[PDB]
Amino acid sequence: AAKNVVSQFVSSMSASADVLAMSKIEIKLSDIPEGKNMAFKWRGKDQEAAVEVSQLRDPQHDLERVKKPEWVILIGVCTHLGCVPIANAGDFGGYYCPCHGS
């Protein structure tokens, strides 16, 4: 009994078909060069776009120059910039390094 039974009550808590719609499929957008800005939230906002959804930061990361392709952005961006950046903490100094910004 309980194994199915208790599951049901419990699983109610677990997740919902609503935010199940999240995990970006879109992403898609946008900027040009600097902006940044370049965020939204959506707690996330595959990607897709392409591909991608690895990350860079939260809020329209969107990638590292989208591996030199697009990003938004595509590093540089406005103050400080996209990845390195710094734009690390309020806003300095560690940027997105790491090393290769990917």
Partner: protein, 241 residues
């Protein structure tokens, strides 16, 4: 003070206990809504999440979803959207507003049909009849112009002009479209609406039953096993007297 007629009970694909829904007609009956009822009556409550249950392939209804929506999106970055994207979205309402709704139908208020089955008495045959029935005004009666005489309507006059005739449409299958078929092909659709879990939920029914016949005789055995002693008593009054 109309004699309230009751629809004769029809068999159905779902009628019986374990009787399931058949999506083939459900797919079709959707188009009807996609064709007809999108005129006025809405259904607000279901996402495009239907996909595979109504058999729609993930892409199939997604791409199908895509065309349905499409409104604005450019108000100083504050939006909604064109082109819904995901399935979470609901249908556009043909009217923004009961004011906009009622006046458009001229004093009539088309209801949302989402649960309406569970609202009206008498299941689906209520509507299917109400679909079927249109009669010739008896001698000694008149109507409001928009009101059309059917004894199925409670006051037996309805502003709804009969939508369904033989081959109003063409089905997705290509099945020849028939007033009754077109009518009857939908009657499964809303029956599904108020209870998506319907098909799924029945599983537990058979699940519990065979589960159920297990334990009771078992319990019934155990109980007695204890009571076996009590009902086995004897008494002896052997007074020293």
């Amino acid at each position: 003070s109309d004699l309230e007629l009751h629809p004769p009970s029809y068999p159905w694909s779902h009628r019986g206990l374990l009787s399931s829904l058949d999506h083939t007609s459900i797919r079709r009956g959707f188009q009807v809504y996609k064709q007809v009822c999108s005129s006025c009556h809405s259904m607000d409550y279901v996402a495009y999440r239907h996909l595979v249950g109504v058999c729609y392939t993930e892409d199939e209804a997604k791409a199908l979803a895509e065309e349905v929506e499409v409104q604005d999106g450019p108000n100083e970055d504050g939006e909604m959207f064109m082109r819904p994207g995901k399935l979470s979205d609901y249908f556009p309402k043909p009217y923004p507003n009961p004011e906009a709704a009622r006046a458009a139908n001229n004093g009539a208020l088309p209801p949302d049909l989402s649960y309406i089955v569970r609202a009206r008495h008498g299941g689906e045959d209520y509507v299917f009849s109400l679909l079927t029935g249109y009669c010739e005004p008896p001698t000694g009666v008149s109507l409001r112009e928009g009101l059309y005489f059917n004894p199925y309507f409670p006051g037996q006059a309805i502003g709804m002009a009969p939508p369904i005739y033989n081959e109003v449409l063409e089905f997705d299958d290509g099945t020849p479209a028939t007033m009754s078929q077109v009518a009857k092909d939908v009657c499964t659709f809303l029956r599904w609406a108020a209870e998506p879990e319907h098909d799924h939920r029945k599983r537990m029914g058979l699940k519990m039953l065979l589960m159920m016949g297990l334990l009771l005789p078992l319990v019934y055995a155990m109980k007695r096993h204890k009571w076996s002693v009590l009902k086995s008593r004897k008494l002896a009054y052997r007074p020293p007297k």
